[PDB]
Structures are given as C-alpha cells and as structure tokens.
Design a protein around this ligand. Sequence first.
Ligand SMILES: CCCCCC(=O)OC[C@H](COP(=O)(O)OC[C@H](N)C(=O)O)OC(=O)CCCCC
Ligand SMILES: CCCCCC(=O)OC[C@H](COP(=O)(O)OC[C@H](N)C(=O)O)OC(=O)CCCCC
Ligand SMILES: [Ca+2]
Ligand SMILES: [Ca+2]
Ligand SMILES: [Ca+2]
Ligand SMILES: [Ca+2]
Ligand SMILES: [Ca+2]
Ligand SMILES: [Ca+2]
Ligand SMILES: [Ca+2]
Ligand SMILES: [Ca+2]
Ligand SMILES: [Ca+2]
Length: 1533
Amino acid sequence: SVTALTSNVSNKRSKPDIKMEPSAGRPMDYQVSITVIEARQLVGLNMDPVVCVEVGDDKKYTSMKESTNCPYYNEYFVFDFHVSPDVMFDKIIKISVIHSKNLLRSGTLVGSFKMDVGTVYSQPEHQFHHKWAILSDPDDISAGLKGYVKCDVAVVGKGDNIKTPHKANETDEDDIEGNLLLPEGVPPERQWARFYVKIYRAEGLPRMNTDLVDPYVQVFFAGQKGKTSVQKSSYEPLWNEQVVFTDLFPPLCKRMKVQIRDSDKVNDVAIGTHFIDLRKISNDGDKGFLPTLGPAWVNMYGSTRNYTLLDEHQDLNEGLGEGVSFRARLMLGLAVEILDTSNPELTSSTEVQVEQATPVSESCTGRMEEFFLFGAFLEASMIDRKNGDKPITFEVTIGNYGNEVDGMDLASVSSTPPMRPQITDRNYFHLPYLERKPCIYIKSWWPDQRRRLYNANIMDHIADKLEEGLNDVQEMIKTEKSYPERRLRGVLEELSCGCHRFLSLSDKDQGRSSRTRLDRERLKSCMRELESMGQQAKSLRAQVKRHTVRDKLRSCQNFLQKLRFLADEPQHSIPDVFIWMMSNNKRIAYARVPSKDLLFSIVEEELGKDCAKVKTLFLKLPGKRGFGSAGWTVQAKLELYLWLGLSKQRKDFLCGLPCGFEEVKAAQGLGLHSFPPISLVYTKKQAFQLRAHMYQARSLFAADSSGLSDPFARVFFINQSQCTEVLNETLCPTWDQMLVFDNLELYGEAHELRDDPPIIVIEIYDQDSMGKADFMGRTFAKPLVKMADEAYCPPRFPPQLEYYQIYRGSATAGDLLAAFELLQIGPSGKADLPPINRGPIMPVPVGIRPVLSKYRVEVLFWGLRDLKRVNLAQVDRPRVDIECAGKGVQSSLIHNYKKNPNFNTLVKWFEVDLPENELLHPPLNIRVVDCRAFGRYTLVGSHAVSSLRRFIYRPPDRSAPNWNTTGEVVVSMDESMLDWWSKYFASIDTMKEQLRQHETAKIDELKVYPKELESEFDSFEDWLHTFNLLRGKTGDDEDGSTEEERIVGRFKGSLCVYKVPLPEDVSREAGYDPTYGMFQGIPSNDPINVLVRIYVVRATDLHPADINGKADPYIAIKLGKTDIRDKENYISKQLNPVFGKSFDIEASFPMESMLTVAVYDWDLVGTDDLIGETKIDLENRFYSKHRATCGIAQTYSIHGYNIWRDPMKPSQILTRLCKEGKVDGPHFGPHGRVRVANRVFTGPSEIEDENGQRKPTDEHVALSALRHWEDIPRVGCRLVPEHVETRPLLNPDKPGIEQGRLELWVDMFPMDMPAPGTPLDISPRKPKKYELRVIVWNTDEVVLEDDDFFTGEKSSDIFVRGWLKGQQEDKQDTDVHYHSLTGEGNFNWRYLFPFDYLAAEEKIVMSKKESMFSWDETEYKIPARLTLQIWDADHFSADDFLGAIELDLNRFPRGAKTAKQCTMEMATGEVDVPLVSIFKQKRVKGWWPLLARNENDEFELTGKVEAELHLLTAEEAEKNPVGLARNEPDPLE
Ligand SMILES: CCCCCC(=O)OC[C@H](COP(=O)(O)OC[C@H](N)C(=O)O)OC(=O)CCCCC
Ligand SMILES: CCCCCC(=O)OC[C@H](COP(=O)(O)OC[C@H](N)C(=O)O)OC(=O)CCCCC
Ligand SMILES: [Ca+2]
Ligand SMILES: [Ca+2]
Ligand SMILES: [Ca+2]
Ligand SMILES: [Ca+2]
Ligand SMILES: [Ca+2]
Ligand SMILES: [Ca+2]
Ligand SMILES: [Ca+2]
Ligand SMILES: [Ca+2]
Ligand SMILES: [Ca+2]
C-alpha cells in the first residue's frame, strides 16, 4: 500500500469539460422551512409575544400568546423563492419577538436574531435542529440577553435530500446553552463590533445619464444599508467617506454588497456591484484575524458601457450574473473594531453612520507599472449564422484600455481588421484567416500587485493538478481500469508536493512596504492551511486502498474546494480581459479570461495556465441570452494566443506561438525588433488528416413528439465540418461511420501538439421533415495525434472507442461512443497513413470497432400497466417490440388489454452480437406499440435500458460458505395500558438511537424506516423490473415538464443476457427448462383479488396551502378504479397532522397495483389544493421474494398491543416459504424447537392469551425462523418486517422539493386466503381528563403599587389571577384584598382547571376556534403550565401587573414551607432547587416567588403566593366535588 502512479492513465484529458452555461445567475427553486418551537426567558413586563419570522423581504407571524415570558408556538413556516444561489444565500433570516402588534400599530421589539441563508446551508445537513436563537437588542449595544427562541431552520434546493430527524416526544430537560443557534466555532457570547467600509475613490465610470454621471456608493451588510455623498459630474469621483455599520461579531451574515449607483431623480440605477466575502478576508480562532481589506482596488463588472434608454442586462449591474464588460474600479477598504460595550464613554446607538474616512494616497495600492497585453487570433470558426454575413471584428479590452468605442510611442491596436465570414455549413461560419492571423496589442497601467496573482496562480496550479488527478481517478474508476487506488496515491503525493512548493514560493517579496494587512494575514493563513493540507494529504495517502478509494476521492474533493476557496484573491489588481465579437459595430458575444491566467512569470508555478498558450475560447451571449434556446448555438470559437505581463518582461512574448511565421508590423514599427506585430504571416504549414470514428451514441435527447429522434452528428475541426448519416426513430443510433477530414492545414509547427491537440466539437441534431434540425446536444473531444515519424503501433494505436459526455446546455443529453485520431501526412505522402478499407460511407475500421461475441437476450414479458391515451384513442391491442443492436424479438399480441394485460408467451429470446467489453454494450430498447388494423401501428411509448449490466447473468458463487447447507447451526432466542402508539414511540426512540450510533426492551417494537420501504429492499426488483415508457419531447431543466409527465405507461418484466455458448453445468445449475429458460421460480401470472389496507399514521412538515400559513389535510387514496377522498375527516389548521386512519380497497392485482396516497388541503370555497402525493407500486411488493405483503412482527402474541396482524400464522408462513423454496422443513419436534434446512432454532414453547394461562404452540420458534430467514442456505432472503415507512410527498406543480413526509405502511392480503380481522386501532390517543385545583391561601410581601394622593402612604389592592390553558379560556380571579399596607393578602380562593391531557406528549389538548370568524374548531396542544399572577385593582383605570410565576406542571420547583424560606432562586436559573411533577406527587403545598422585570431588565421579587396544587382525574373529581371560590361543596374561610 505504498506504490503509486504519478502519470495520467486514462484518456480524461482527451475529453474536455467545456460548458456554455455557468452556474452564475441561474435561478433555482429554494425553500426555507422554519419551525418556531418555543421561546424562553423573554424580557418584558406582561408581554404578549409574537414571533416574527422574516426571510429576505417576506415576513410571517406566529399566533399571539397571552402574558408569558416562556411561550410555546410549534408553528411551521415555508418561504419559497426562485432565485440564483448567490442572491438566495445573501437573504437575511431574522427571527424576532414583538408584542402589542395590531391592525394599525407596529409591534414593540423585544429582541432579534440575525443570520443568513448561507450559514444555514453550510451546516452538515443544510439545517439546524432544535437550536436556540440568541435574541439581542439590535438598537442597543449595552443591552444584554433578550431571550432565546428554540427553532428549526432548514434550507433545501431543487433535488436536495435531507435526513430530517423524526418528531418524537420532547419530554426532556433540554439545555439552552449547549444547543445554541450558532455555527461551529462561533462563541456563545458575541461582542458588538463596528464595520468601517472605507470608500476612497473610483475610476473609469461609463456613461449613465444620456452625458455625465453622479455616483455614490451604497453598502449593504446584514440587512442594514448606508450610502456616501453624491459626487456630482465626475467620471473619477473622490469620496473619502466610510460607512460604519454596528453589528454582532462574528457576523452570521457573511457577505457584504458594495454597489456604485448613479443618482437621478427619474430612476436610480446601479453601475456596478462587488461582493466582499467575509469568509475570504477573515479567519476564526486564536490563529485567526479580524476582517480586514485594502486599501486596494476592486474591479466591478456588469452590462455593456454604451448608453441605452432601457437595459436588458441591468441585472448584471446589480451583480446578479456574470459581468460582460468592465464598469468601474473602486478603491476600497474594511476594518473591524470590537467595541467595549461596558464603557459609557461611547454612544450605544447602532445606526449606520457615514463619516469622513482618513484619505490615503494612490501609492498605497502599489506603484503603477506598464502592462503589455498581446493577442493572436489563430483561428475563428463556428460563428453563429444568425448574426448575419456582415464583416466581423474581435475587440479585446482590459479595463477601459483598448475600448475605443465605450471606454474612457506605441499606439494600441485593440481590434482585428474586419473580415467577411465564409460558410462552413448551414448553421456556422468561419473567418478565413489562413496563413494571416490578426493580432492585437494593448498598453495598460495597473498598480504592481503581481504577488497576489502569483500566489493565486500557484494555488490554482495545485488545484488544477488535483482536479485533473481526481478526474482521472473518477474516469478510470468508471471505465474499470486496473488499480484505481494507485493513481489516487500519486495524486495525493503531487498534492503534498505542490503544497510544500507553495510554502517555498510564496515567501518571496515579503519586504515590500505596499502590502496591506489583508495581504500579510492571508499569506499566513494560506501558508498554514496549505501546510496542514500537505500533512493531511500525506496522512490520507496511507488510508487510500482498494476498497476505500471511492470515499477518499470524496475526501480529496474537500481539498479541491478548499484550494479553490483559498485561490480567490479578494483584492483585485488587474481587471479581466474581455474578447468581444462585433458586426456592424454591435456587441454580439463575449468571453471573459481572468488576468491572473494570462500573467507571465519566470517561475513556472507563478505562471498563468493560459499565458503564452493558445487558448480555446467559446464566446457566449451576454446575460440571460446565454441560457436557454438562444445560448444553444456556438456564438464563436477562437484559438486565441494570449500573453500578459510587464512591458519590461515582453522579450519572450512570442515564444508560445507555433513556429514559422513572419512578423508584419505597423508603419511606426518598421526597423524595431521590440515592436509587436499587427499580424503573423505563416510560411510553414503541416498537412493533417482527422478520422472521426462516429460509432454509436446512447441516451440521447428526444426532440420529436414520439419520444424519439432522427440523430446525425456533425463534426467540426478547424474550419471544416462533415455529417454522419441520419438514422431514423432512435435515441441510440449506431452510425458506424468514419469521417475523414482530408488535407487539413495546421499553420505552423505547434509546440506540444501531441499533448494539447486542437479541440473537436461534435453536435447531435434531430433531422426534421422540412430541412430544419433541432439541437440535441454537444460534446467535445481531443484527437490522439500521430506524428509523421511515429509508428501506428500499440499501445497507443489504434485508438479505442470511449464515451464522450454530451450536454444540452447544462443538462446531460447522453454519451457518444467515438474515437478520434489526427494523423500527420508525412513527406512521403499519404502512403504512411493506415489503409482505409453503403456506397461512399466508410465504416469504422477493424481494431477500433468493438470485437463482437454472440449473446442471447431472454425477455420476460410480465404485463403492461397504466397505458395512457395515444393521440386521443384508448390502447386496446398492445405489443412490445424489443430491439438491441439491430436484432430483437416481438412479444405475443395482447388481444384485449382491458380484460387481462398479460402475455400468452411468458418468455421469448433472441440472439445478438454484443461487444466483448460489457461497458461498450449498446442499450436495449423497449418499444410498446398499439397494433391497429390494416398495419396502422402507432407508437405508445418507449423506454431505453441504458445498462445491461444489471441483467447480465453470471453463475452464482456456490463456493461461498452460505451455500454449504451441511452441519447443524443452533440459533437461540399499567402493563395493559399499552397500545400501538406505545410500540410506535418505542420504535421511534430506538431508531433515533440507531441513527446516533450509525453517525458515531420491555415494549416490543417495529422497524421505523426514515425513507421508503423500497429504499431498503432494492425497490423489490429481485425478479421483476419496471421500465417507464416515455413519449413526447424531453423538457428542459428550466420551464420544462420533467420526465414524470412524459411517462405514458409501464412495462413489467425482466431481462437476462448471457453468452450463448453456455457450459452444460452452468445451464443445469440455473435450471434451464425450455418453457421459461433462465427465469425460474416465476409466480403465477393469473389475476388475483388483493385486499389492500393502507394504514396512514401521520404527516410531518406539510407545505401550507392556505392564506393563513396552515392547511387542512385529509387523505385521498387512488388505487385502480377506486378513488377515495376523505374530505369529511380533514384536520383543521394543522401542518403536522396525526391521521391514525386505515383504508380498505379491494384491487384486482396485478392490474390495479399503482397505489397513490395523497394529502389534500380542504378548502371551503374553490377546489381542494394538492399538498403532495407518493406512488408505491404494490405489484413489486406483492410478487417479491422479500414477502412485502404483510410485515412480520418481532415477537408473537395473540392479544393486546402486540397482536399478530397477519391471518397467516408464523408456522403457516414458514411452511409456505419452505414449500415454495423446496427446503426440507419446517420440522417441528417438541414445541420449543424447529429444524429448517441445516439450521435449528429454539425459543419459548408457550403462548399467553388475554386470560394469561399457558398453552403450547410452535409460533414463537416459527417466528424466530422467519426473523432469521436470511441465514437459510438455499433460498434465504431478508423478509420485510412490520414497519412504518416515511414516504416523501411530491407535487408536480413544485417539482424537485419534498414538501411533506407521510408516515404509513401498506398490508396486502390475497382474498383467496382466509381474510384478516379488523384493522389495527392506530387512531390517536384519547386524552385523559383531569382537574387541577389551586387553592390560593395568602400572599406575602407584595409590592405596593398605589400612592395616596393626599397623605402619601403606599398600598396595594392585591388579587391573584390564575389560568392553565390560557387567558381567554381559563382565567379566574380572586376577590380583591383591598388596601394592603404591608403586602399581606388573605384570599382562601379555589381555582378549578378541568383539562384534557396526553401523558406521552405532556400536552394539554383543547378544541377551540382560531378566531370568531373561523369555520371550524382546531385542536391545539400547549404545555401544561399553571400561571399565577399578582395584580393591583384600580377603580378608574386598568389593573396594574405586579408579578408572575409560570409553573410547568412536570418541572416546577417545590414550594417553600414558609414565606420567609421562599427566595428568588426557586424560579430563576439556579439548579439548587429540586423539581417536582404534579402528575406523580398529586398534591403540593408551599410558597412560590413572583417575579417582574424592572427598567434595569433584571428580575426582582415583587411578591410571594401560598398555593396548594391538587391534581385529580375527572372521575376522582366527580366523586369528591368542590365548588369554585369559597362556595359549596367544601367551603373555604
Ligand atoms: C377577496 C379576498 C381574497 C383573499 C386572498 C385570496 O386570494 O384568497 C383565495 C381564497 C383561498 O384560496 P386558497 O386557500 O386555495 O389560497 C391559498 C393558495 N392556494 C396558496 O397556497 O397560496 O380563495 C377564494 O377566495 C376562492 C377562489 C376561487 C373561487 C372559485
Ligand atoms: C361560503 C359562505 C361564506 C363563508 C365564509 C367563511 O367562513 O370563510 C372562511 C374563513 C374563515 O374560516 P377558515 O379560516 O377556517 O377557512 C376554512 C378553511 N381553513 C379554508 O382554507 O377554506 O372566513 C374568513 O376568513 C372571513 C374573515 C372575515 C373578517 C372580517
Ligand atoms: Ca445622474
Ligand atoms: Ca423534431
Ligand atoms: Ca425529427
Ligand atoms: Ca387552500
Ligand atoms: Ca384550506
Ligand atoms: Ca383552493
Ligand atoms: Ca394602581
Ligand atoms: Ca389599586
Ligand atoms: Ca393603573
């Protein structure tokens, strides 16, 4: 485990990853789900808290809780967005607590918590679970903690899969400080800090008014904003003004948007936008540093600088996409000063100040040095013909230098001379440069910050080597080359060598005084991080082995993304080089090359990856026009030589070009050797011949309404194009055509031509009837070059066919099995070339085409399910035509699809020559057609089995010890208040424990699956497979209808592919009979009635479908003809419903087998909205060898909560499984044992019924045999247990985002068997009725609120206010103890609080209307908390709140014996007071403190109350009745 390969093994370098659609600016469906659970320790006096949840500009509110500092909400909010990831992660999640909000007055804020979406998305599962948001006053740095809000915050994108923890009972003493809502590394106490965004000056602004500009800089940070003054009429404005924000440190909103804007009274418009990432300019920990930046320049990009009345690329000026032109450069700085909040010498205001910053000079950013940029357009081809045949120039700009139309000694030549295009084909032009390549040269002046670009070049060189190595490892894993773990160890060796090389290279020029603080701190951080990366790579090299390569590759992806993170320099020096295509002086398409990629250095690692090299550029349409249908066509394709560096370093600026050219220079440059040329005239040229072996394609795009295409491939090389033949009605053509590009001319002897060949562009096109063609995708290739002196010999020659990944923009559009070679025509002519062996169409020659071996494909035709309407007519006589590689077989004609969609001949077969390499196997096509009369066959649908590797038969490994089947192996094994919810909650807790164990017994259990049941049992495809038939054109990833709409049916069956010379012992061990073949043990195809019983347990995190933020869910189940819609049993205003339902549907299997369980929002007016649905496909479950009909329980009992559901007893199931599998057994001897095959099981021999007396039985040991059925030697299989699966709910209207989790399970019982009993009572628990009697005896030391108007003595009119469920449903007041001069009150007043209680959830259940106008009663679950308050009664004003205590009825402090022993420490955060539950001790008498918050925001003792809590049931309360207050029965004094 030491040896390694340090060279590329596969041909991944010949398969470029060029894409025309970047991820920048692409909108994507996002969803932020925030579940406000509760709040604690809120700061206020008699507050009615409402939690306001804002994400971005959208805001939602919880319900109002009356008079509590520890409220409980359990309310679910969903915020939906369709924005780009950079916009979405910059949105500010603000969880606030307000009070006194009504229809006209905004609420008074208690505290707020700020964090952005990107901090939530950087979590391990893109979420926080059960974490407490630290509330702080956002308008006061001297204010303390304002409370905590326990909440879940989750962010999901389109296609994200999140393991959400299940909603168990929350009956635990949760820790607030150990579970805060902070990312890891952020301290629990966050100081206040000031963010000085110093803005000095700007340069090179474009035209904005018509013609001047009046710029200012607006800075956005963490939801705050502030702007500088307006510098009127200035292209080079000077502010010297700092925008000072005041915010918590470290900030959880980690990006800052600096944006130059133009002042205008008509419309305020953005000029340019740069985002300062605070991650890249700071580090955390003891070795970290505060966020610092500058004083250094920053380059902003956006739309084109020409003025228009309206700008369709205005979003580029807002930073919402990739900038297509240089807008301005802004000299910028940032400093963070941590404030001392305990010092009253500074103001405590948090408002954004705009002050005068200290001015710094232009020399602080570095001395200006002359930079020389040179370009040479060697090739221009693949120009879009929709631009017209007008003359085409290429204008190169860098900053404003070279922009002679919109921007603002040697004279710079920035544009090529105009050249009229010539036709390549019907879609593309090319410019005929030939021997005369046009050239550009631009003089520019930038500050000398080349050290930053050199360090970024070294880091990106290490990242490029690592990325090429990981792509090599991934590719030769995919193509199954030998020893992938040897290459990855060499990749880690190269990574550690590069990381060690960076430490020796980046220490140069540290003595320069022009370095900023960010330069020094980031150099130290990069040195430390790359040293740790090198040591981690050397440690990970020892862990790379044969079986662990595929996850150390994922670990190396973390090193790759960390290198890409560290390589981005935040202080820009030189703006990016833009290359624009122009015709009729109109900007058409652009490319953007970073200037660090073109920068020249003596050191090889500091050299840019594109400096002194011919770079293949693909110009794209600016802004949104580069995506979608407009960006499909190649706008242009350039082979552009580029060099950038100092003008003192331009001695070797022509060294990377191909040799053999004469420099033709300008008229002022005659006689000067150092003058750059305006053109190159090549005299040397090399003849070449390209062979494009277009053999095959697969999985291609469907561009016709039948779901197929007519593909042909057009191959582009230099300025030439050739086409393959059109193959009709296929998505996997076998073109088998070699395209010979004869007498190609490569101008000049290109350096390293064998290592960097010119790129080949291949475009697939669907031929249509009227001569037009639909774009089907594009792949790229690099030919494997033969020189004239080379021999056409192995191992390099002839080239092997490889799969090239085709892209329809960003989506994958199949693979192209092809090989490309570029053979040089030598001095002897074409006789040195290999010989070339359908008319003029040439086949792929022998040695490149795959060697074929004979196979047999046996097809099981099981049935056809859910065939939709073809055209408008119903399918009635379907037939399945299956074709692979030109051969095939056709199924028996289904003479009537309605009565039985089954095939008379179960298995057919055909023989077909397939390649010896199983990776080169062509896909097999299933094609269902409706056989009408007179030969009028119409296409119903088509499925493409892309890989036959799943269906390839190989003989089983009978040398495994499981098959040995010899030698005996012995395997051994109130209270009546339990229900199904007991075992369900036990299984939920157990599943939580196994999830904790995988990350790092008195109650019998089932198996709770966090996913579907299909996810744990290989989708029940052990013998029967599903093939979704498709029709219609494929939809795009944006504005498409996706694959699920195109499904027009399902074909049921299997495939079995093997080499047709089978050995006779292989065929006999497979049991080949002539009636079926390889498909043995196939069950009966006859129709059978099946009782389907769907138990719906609950749903969690349902998407809101009403205007109040909630929904009214009910269960609608569709199965065959049966369409149950349970609208009468909807649960009102609940997003986490507990259904507890069971539905019985008698379905005719295997026809009515597609089960759809859906959740619908009931609406009083209009149609009921769909929340989500899931498809279960019960046919695969019913016919599986896993026995997914009825789940098998852990232990057997015939009564109670653990009752055996199945009408077949475990002995009958064991007998059936032994009979079907031909296993000798079951052999019951005595009742405590059974022998099945070579294994003997033992267990208990007696069962107990409801009376509890014993009875001998065999069912325990039979169930023990069924639980260990996987260990059976011959036909052993893991049986499906009794389970609750969690199926996600999907909406076609909002695709890709799961918006519900429906927990259920399905039981199936054949009706020819004995019927099952009644369904299980999984209905939710009825709450036990109780009554809490709180006798308020006295009060002591209550504060005196009133003051005497005439004599000044203090007094208080004390009365006690108590409630259990709420102020509007359980409020009871004692009579007023008037005129208390010492705080003593005498009440002897009894409260009565009847309430319904769930013991497991510890929640009071109450049914009440949400409002006065609400249609129905809503079930609410609140914590059982008794609130006792003291008040002062006023005759001519409102009563005054004095103090309160909130006693949680499970965790309240024990009351003191006297009033003197009562202190504040009973109710505050001290742990020294023991806790007492009223549900256990049943009577508590004592004294309790009453607390109120003063204006210093601490708690104070405002009184004490003597109380006697006494909990009974309703049955105990009825047999011992008492009256309210002091009334009979049991009167009080
Ligand atoms: C005039 C008062 C307007 C008040 C605001 C408004 O538009 O209310 C729509 C209401 C409620 O409809 P939903 O709950 O489905 O809307 C919620 C939505 N599905 C969502 O999830 O966003 O519908 C009607 O009034 C009847 C319409 C059809 C009548 C045939
Ligand atoms: C058909 C005759 C009129 C029937 C009017 C009626 O009852 O409308 C229903 C709603 C209240 O009922 P729900 O919110 O439960 O809606 C039910 C369920 N959650 C749903 O989604 O629809 O009425 C208002 O909002 C009126 C507020 C007026 C304030 C002044
Ligand atoms: Ca203006
Ligand atoms: Ca078409
Ligand atoms: Ca077509
Ligand atoms: Ca609705
Ligand atoms: Ca509704
Ligand atoms: Ca509706
Ligand atoms: Ca008063
Ligand atoms: Ca009073
Ligand atoms: Ca008052």
